[PDB]
Amino acid sequence: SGFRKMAFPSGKVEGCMVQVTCGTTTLNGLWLDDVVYCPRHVICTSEDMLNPNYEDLLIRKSNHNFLVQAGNVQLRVIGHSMQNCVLKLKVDTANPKTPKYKFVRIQPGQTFSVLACYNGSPSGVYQCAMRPNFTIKGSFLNGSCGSVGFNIDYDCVSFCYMHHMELPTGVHAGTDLEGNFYGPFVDRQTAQAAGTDTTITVNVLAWLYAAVINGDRWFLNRFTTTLNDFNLVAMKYNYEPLTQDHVDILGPLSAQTGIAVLDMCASLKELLQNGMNGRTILGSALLEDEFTPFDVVRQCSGVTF
Amino acid sequence: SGFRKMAFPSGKVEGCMVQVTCGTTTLNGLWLDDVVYCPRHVICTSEDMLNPNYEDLLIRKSNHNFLVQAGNVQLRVIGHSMQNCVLKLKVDTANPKTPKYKFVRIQPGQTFSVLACYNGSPSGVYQCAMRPNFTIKGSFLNGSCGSVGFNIDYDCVSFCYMHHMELPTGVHAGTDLEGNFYGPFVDRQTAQAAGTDTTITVNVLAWLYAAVINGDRWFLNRFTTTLNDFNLVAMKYNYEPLTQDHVDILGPLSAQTGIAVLDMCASLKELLQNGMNGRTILGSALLEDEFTPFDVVRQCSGVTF
Numbered sequence: 293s294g295f296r297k298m299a300f301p302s303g304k305v306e307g308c309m310v311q312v313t314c315g316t317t318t319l320n321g322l323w324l325d326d327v328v329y330c331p332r333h334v335i336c337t338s339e340d341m342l343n344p345n346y347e348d349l350l351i352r353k354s355n356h357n358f359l360v361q362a363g364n365v366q367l368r369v370i371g372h373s374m375q376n377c378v379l380k381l382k383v384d385t386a387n388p389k390t391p392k393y394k395f396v397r398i399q400p401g402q403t404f405s406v407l408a409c410y411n412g413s414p415s416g417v418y419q420c421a422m423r424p425n426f427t428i429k430g431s432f433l434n435g436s437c438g439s440v441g442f443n444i445d446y447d448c449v450s451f452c453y454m455h456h457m458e459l460p461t462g463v464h465a466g467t468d469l470e471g472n473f474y475g476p477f478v479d480r481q482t483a484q485a486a487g488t489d490t491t492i493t494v495n496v497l498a499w500l501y502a503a504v505i506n507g508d509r510w511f512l513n514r515f516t517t518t519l520n521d522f523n524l525v526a527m528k529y530n531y532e533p534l535t536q537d538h539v540d541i542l543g544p545l546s547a548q549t550g551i552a553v554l555d556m557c558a559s560l561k562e563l564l565q566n567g568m569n570g571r572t573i574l575g576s577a578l579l580e581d582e583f584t585p586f587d588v589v590r591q592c593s594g595v596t597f
Numbered sequence: 598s599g600f601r602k603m604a605f606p607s608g609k610v611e612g613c614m615v616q617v618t619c620g621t622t623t624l625n626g627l628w629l630d631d632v633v634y635c636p637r638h639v640i641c642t643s644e645d646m647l648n649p650n651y652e653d654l655l656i657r658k659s660n661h662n663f664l665v666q667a668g669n670v671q672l673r674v675i676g677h678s679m680q681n682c683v684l685k686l687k688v689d690t691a692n693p694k695t696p697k698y699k700f701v702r703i704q705p706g707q708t709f710s711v712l713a714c715y716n717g718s719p720s721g722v723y724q725c726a727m728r729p730n731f732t733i734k735g736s737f738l739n740g741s742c743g744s745v746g747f748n749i750d751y752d753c754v755s756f757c758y759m760h761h762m763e764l765p766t767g768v769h770a771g772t773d774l775e776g777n778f779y780g781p782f783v784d785r786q787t788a789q790a791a792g793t794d795t796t797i798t799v800n801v802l803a804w805l806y807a808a809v810i811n812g813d814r815w816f817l818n819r820f821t822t823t824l825n826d827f828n829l830v831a832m833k834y835n836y837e838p839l840t841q842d843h844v845d846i847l848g849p850l851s852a853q854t855g856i857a858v859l860d861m862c863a864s865l866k867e868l869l870q871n872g873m874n875g876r877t878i879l880g881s882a883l884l885e886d887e888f889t890p891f892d893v894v895r896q897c898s899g900v901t902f
């Protein structure tokens with residue numbers, strides 16, 4: 293029993309973290325085989341960020357201008373290239389601790405573990421979700437750039453995020469491991485703001501099913517709803533529209549508990565209208581949206597209480 | 598910016614997890630040097646749990662009755678002994694991945710990371726606190742016994758908890774690595790319950806300071822209070838008494854924000870007597886008590902390992 297925001301064991305990623313230095317800037321890199329991946333803004337000064345010409349800044353660099361440190365060993369850079377917003381530094385040593393891995397681009401609503409790093413050294417691990425506005429609510433200080441997001445289903449590490457930026461509201465933006473940013477963000481200091489964020493409806497429903505599996509049913513009601521009527525109510529509370537794909541994905545949780553998806557939608561409608569009345573659901577006084585249906589299945593017992 | 602429930606990087610502990618089997622029972626073990634540490638109830642059947650005589654059950658077992666598996670390699674047990682509620686299995690192979698470590702007993706209010714394991718394989722990592730009633734609010738299913746709790750200090754892993762039991766309310770109980778239980782619990786199937794719990798006051802204050810560091814100031818006021826008047830209010834809301842030691846420990850957070858500890862106590866007094874009035878603090882509608890003053894300092898500073 294119990295339900296916690298759980299991250300994947302970070303050991304396989306810890307063995308890939310390195311420090312990348314270019315001039316006076318120092319950040320983190322990800323060392324997989326003989327390549328170190330890091331944000332391309334490592335070659336920028338603060339003044340360069342207003343309007344950087346990365347192609348012009350990069351051509352003035354040689355391999356020996358990049359210092360890569362793995363633990364207390366200096367790696368040697370033997371090539372460099374830029375792919376979108378990431379820099380790929382070819383090194384003379386393949387990482388002997390390289391795990392089985394894949395690069396995957398995720399969709400909003402999907403969760404992942406973040407290994408926060410400073411100076412190539414891991415400091416902590418926490419669970420995050422890609423918000424509908426393509427930002428993440430992380431915990432990052434100066435020096436955390438290059439820290440990565442990942443999932444580890446089986447023994448394979450699926451890298452999905454690399455940290456690049458903090459926005460004015462304290463939320464974070466980054467790229468996939470091919471250097472493509474999530475959202476309309478750019479690696480330039482310009483008027484960039486997080487768009488209006490919304491609640492990940494399919495994840496709230498998944499967490500209500502987790503509460504039922506763990507033994508709580510107080511929030512259920514005798515009503516049902518059509519999918520369109522539920523969406524008309526949901527959008528009034530800044531909740532994301534629920535699609536047929538989301539209803540399909542909730543199928544296994546619906547079968548394990550015996551509660552139809554549109555009947556759980558009716559409980560969600562009532563909870564939005566009434567609040568909790570001094571009660572909690574899985575130790576929370578707010579409706580939780582950073583657990584996917586897959587996360588609930590992974591953590592919860594296969595037997596409902 | 599940002600504030601997340603952060604766990605320590607789990608890599609150093611992942612390299613110590615093994616599977617221990619005795620008869621039909623299978624659980625987790627911690628392999629450090631040539632010793633595997635696991636709950637002594639591994640030698641019990643369901644019938645033996647009603648009233649076990651561990652010395653009598655153990656004398657009937659030989660070294661070859663214990664199956665220890667580290668990955669896909671079978672370790673050989675060459676000796677066995679019992680220390681309190683922990684079994685120590687001497688193996689023929691020293692763990693080449695043994696980190697720098699210590700066994701430390703923690704006090705209620707202290708936090709630690711848990712690496713949840715099943716069949717000697719790590720599945721997740723999460724943060725939790727030792728409650729004043731000596732239980733932890735963990736997330737564990739059948740097979741999780743032997744999973745460990747820890748903190749990291751530079752290069753050194755301080756093991757503080759080993760999982761043994763789930764109580765009727767869904768909360769958990771266990772021992773330190775010397776086999777001494779936290780709380781008045783016993784390792785047998787009998788009527789045991791979590792006592793009435795209380796809120797960890799020094800941790801709520803630490804989290805209010807974290808909210809001020811991150812830009813949440815609505816709860817501050819012009820008032821102050823004394824230790825005695827604050828404790829008279831706290832006792833009424835099932836909050837732990839605040840001591841001069843707690844005030845001293847909150848010193849660095851008080852200096853960083855410019856808010857005296859008794860000044861912050863006056864803000865908590867008003868939150869206890871009036872509530873949040875539809876507002877949140879660091880994304881929560883409840884007063885969070887599972888972040889110590891040291892956890893707030895570490896997360897708002899970037900301490901690496």
Ligand SMILES: C[C@@]1(C(=O)Nc2cncc3c2CCCC3)CNS(=O)(=O)c2ccc(Cl)cc21
Nearest residue numbers: 333341432433434456457458478479480481598
């Ligand atoms: C490198 C930087 C950034 O966001 N750093 C950072 C990234 N994560 C967290 C924290 C920071 C800063 C301090 C608080 C914590 C610098 N600011 S910027 O507006 O010029 C900018 C603009 C675009 C990009 Cl891709 C990066 C940056």
Ligand SMILES: C[C@@]1(C(=O)Nc2cncc3c2CCCC3)CNS(=O)(=O)c2ccc(Cl)cc21
Nearest residue numbers: 293646737738739741761762763783784785786
């Ligand atoms: C081994 C067991 C235990 O709590 N297992 C367990 C531990 N963590 C989680 C979950 C369980 C069980 C199933 C639900 C989830 C079994 N119950 S018991 O009352 O006989 C008992 C009594 C004393 C001790 Cl030290 C252990 C146990």
Ligand SMILES: [Cl-]
Nearest residue numbers: 397398399402
């Ligand atoms: Cl996805």
